[PDB]
Amino acid sequence: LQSLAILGATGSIGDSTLAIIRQHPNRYRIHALTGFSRVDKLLALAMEFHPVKICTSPDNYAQLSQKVTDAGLDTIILSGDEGLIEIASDEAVDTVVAAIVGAAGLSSTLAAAGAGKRILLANKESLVMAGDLVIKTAKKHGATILPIDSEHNAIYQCLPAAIQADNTAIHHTSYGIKKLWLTASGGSFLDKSIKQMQNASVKEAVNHPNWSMGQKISIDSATMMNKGLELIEACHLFDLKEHQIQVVIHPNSVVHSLVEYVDGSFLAQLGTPDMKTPIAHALAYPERIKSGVMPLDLYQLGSLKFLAPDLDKFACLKLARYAARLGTGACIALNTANEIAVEAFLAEKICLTDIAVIVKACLDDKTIAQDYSQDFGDEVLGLERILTMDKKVRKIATAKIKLLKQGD
Amino acid sequence: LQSLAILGATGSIGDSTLAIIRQHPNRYRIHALTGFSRVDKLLALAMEFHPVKICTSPDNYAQLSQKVTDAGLDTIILSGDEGLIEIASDEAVDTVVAAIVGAAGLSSTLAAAGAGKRILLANKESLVMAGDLVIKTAKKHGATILPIDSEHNAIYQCLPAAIQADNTAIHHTSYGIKKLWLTASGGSFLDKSIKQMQNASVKEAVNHPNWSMGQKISIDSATMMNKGLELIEACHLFDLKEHQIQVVIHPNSVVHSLVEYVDGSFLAQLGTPDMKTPIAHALAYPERIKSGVMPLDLYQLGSLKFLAPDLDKFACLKLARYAARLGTGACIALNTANEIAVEAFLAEKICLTDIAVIVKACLDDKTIAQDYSQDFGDEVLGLERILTMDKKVRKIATAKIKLLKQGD
Ligand SMILES: NC(=O)c1ccc[n+]([C@@H]2O[C@H](COP(=O)([O-])OP(=O)(O)OC[C@H]3O[C@@H](n4cnc5c(N)ncnc54)[C@H](O)[C@@H]3O)[C@@H](O)[C@H]2O)c1
Ligand SMILES: NC(=O)c1ccc[n+]([C@@H]2O[C@H](COP(=O)([O-])OP(=O)(O)OC[C@H]3O[C@@H](n4cnc5c(N)ncnc54)[C@H](O)[C@@H]3O)[C@@H](O)[C@H]2O)c1
Ligand SMILES: O=CN(O)CCCP(=O)(O)O
Ligand SMILES: O=CN(O)CCCP(=O)(O)O
Ligand SMILES: [Mg+2]
Ligand SMILES: [Mg+2]
């Protein structure tokens, strides 16, 4: 049985992964599950799956340990980043599903690449922040990365075998890859005024017509920063630069992305927008298995729309491309600034449209820009350099926010 | 240089193939070209490409031989089926592009499979009439068949490598193929009354909103018999039965077909509707090359529509499925009856809607049905059995036509 560690098992992605595991009992073995806040849910999962190890936040380690011994499970309990690193590099784990949101998922993603694991990547902030380091580290140790993110999973499915195996093979012109097309729903405000986004409630922004997801990715979809980040994720995953990856607005969320070839062929993945499809694909690869989705019904589709992005309205996307060209430092500035203006939007401290302002101000800040020219990809020293800039952007972005609520 | 024989070089498919050859001068060598009626065009091609051999109709052999000696080419001239068989099995030919329309292309398609060639198949009537025989013969001698037909080329592009190599691999459930979806434009009368198809001029039926093609395939698209035939072609190519292949109406002709997988993934090929894309793909396979098409612009797409087939209105499609289930005899009855009611529609002897009547009457005719249980796939005797039934359906369909213009 393929041994699984599911980092971030209590969230949206975790739910879908587990929904597939329950359909395929004697194919996968759960070795570990992790959860930051939802201690009871993690316990309920523990009791269901009898995992060898679980990990939670340090604030909950004691509480959860009591509850696990009280339930008489053999389960080892772990806490913090230290626990995640352990599970991610555990000799007994074959496959890691990286579903921790944000930067918090970076160190365990690396540990997994360092340990040579099969990694199923949901956690895109890992690649936006440490793409060179993660891929380099993975290549060096024999880790395979398969993307779970819909768009990337689509693209991956639409790529010849040799380029799934080795992403550098994509520069051999025989394979004829021209460019990659990322589909974007346009989010909750696509078809609404600039003015109306300004006054968006969290309830409006957080709820998406086609997808049910975590809070963060949800907001990122509303501003289109999600595509931004996906743009940078794609560059690392498929070993390309941003000019080779373009974005098309597609509100139906049926077409999940395309690969354009030199002969005129666009290979695309279509499906109902349900993350069990890409998770299932990535779990069973190179085989396939039933996912439990309700399949897309082509008869009732109606009309699938396509539309160029409106960049004035979705500045987050302009700014992500700009950052992708600047390299890893600017992508960190990008992602972290954005991580901060999201905690801030959901806390109701800024407007939705303020997410763009904070992120630019951060990309164009002189104190942030000093670190753009650093070697964030050094095998020994890249990690501390990435985290230090993280802490730094955290401070400055926080400062920018406070400054804005009055004036600069 | 890959040596090419282009059977049917003067038609629509031939034009597109050659348009690609002219873009790729030192990749492909033209060893042979063939043309039935258009002697001057065949000559002009001869002078352009200095082929080793060409073949024409028997009625033109003398005329063309004079003209070739008058122009001082070294080119060997051939005639009739005998000439096609020779070119198709020529020791010096690597690749055969099978683009003769109708049943007339069957014997040379077989000769090419018998000789173990790489075959690029446009000519779908070959598989509708002798699918088992062609595939069996190909497998036995090491011939590779790559489809040029848009839908089949799309499906092929959307299939894993192992199933492109060996079509029987598709029954291994690991690969997770659920079903194949054939897209159909719905033709010139999709959005028009039954009543208005009745009175269709040849000019209406022959001209297609999105495609420029030969006359026959053009009419077949109007009645939707083209999808019928494509349905049977798909069964042989991909080694499935008709229940596994469904049809969706898609008027934009952008999405060219899909492959549905068990996890919910639909892989589809999109592109501007231009046969240079699939020809180019098939020529360079497993590599890719520029095709000279103007690529699809996703920004200006608008809305791609999808719609269930209206089977009352497109009886030809009901009847093809029925025939696919009946087996090869009924497919011959189907294809030939249809070949006859097309010569008859374009000659202005029957109504467009009469194509359906003639073909049913032929499928349900007791004299035709006697031969349904024959072994059309016997390596020694299948070919004469296929041609005899052809001649027979030709006679009876002709009779049915004459009968209808008065009454049965
Ligand atoms: N939700 C989707 O459908 C979807 C689609 C594509 C990509 N993704 C990506 O997958 C990842 C997870 O997204 P999600 O929507 O499931 O997130 P979520 O908000 O549902 O939470 C995910 C998990 O992260 C854990 N977590 C949160 N903060 C943590 C911390 N500081 N340390 C350790 N663990 C922590 C939570 O306990 C939870 O199990 C993200 O990177 C997201 O961008 C999600
Ligand atoms: N035209 C397209 O875009 C297209 C698309 C998909 C499939 N196809 C298929 O490819 C094949 C070619 O179609 P097309 O539209 O290019 O045809 P066409 O009518 O334009 O050309 C047919 C070719 O075959 C030759 N031919 C015709 N009758 C013959 C006979 N009785 N004996 C010997 N040779 C003969 C002609 O000389 C000509 O070169 C058909 O089977 C068609 O269904 C064509
Ligand atoms: O992989 C799935 N997602 O990231 C959800 C996408 C929401 P968006 O298409 O509006 O970016
Ligand atoms: O391969 C291309 N064609 O067969 C032209 C198809 C026209 P249709 O979609 O109405 O069958
Ligand atoms: Mg995504
Ligand atoms: Mg076709």
Coordinates of C-alpha atoms in Angstrom, one line a residue, chain A residues 225 315-316 318-319 322 333-334 337-338 354-366 368 372 400:
Chain A
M225 CA -4.1 37.4 -7.5
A315 CA -4.0 44.8 -11.0
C316 CA -3.0 41.9 -8.9
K318 CA -0.3 42.9 -13.7
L319 CA 1.7 42.9 -10.5
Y322 CA 5.9 42.1 -13.1
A333 CA 7.4 40.5 -1.7
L334 CA 4.3 39.7 -3.8
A337 CA 2.5 41.4 1.1
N338 CA -0.7 39.7 -0.3
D354 CA -6.8 47.9 -1.2
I355 CA -5.1 44.5 -1.7
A356 CA -3.7 45.9 -5.0
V357 CA -2.3 49.1 -3.4
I358 CA -0.5 47.4 -0.6
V359 CA 1.2 44.8 -2.9
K360 CA 2.4 47.4 -5.3
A361 CA 3.6 49.7 -2.6
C362 CA 5.5 46.7 -1.3
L363 CA 7.0 45.7 -4.7
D364 CA 8.1 49.3 -5.3
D365 CA 9.4 49.8 -1.8
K366 CA 13.2 50.5 -1.7
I368 CA 12.1 45.5 0.0
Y372 CA 15.6 41.2 -4.9
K400 CA 1.9 50.1 4.7

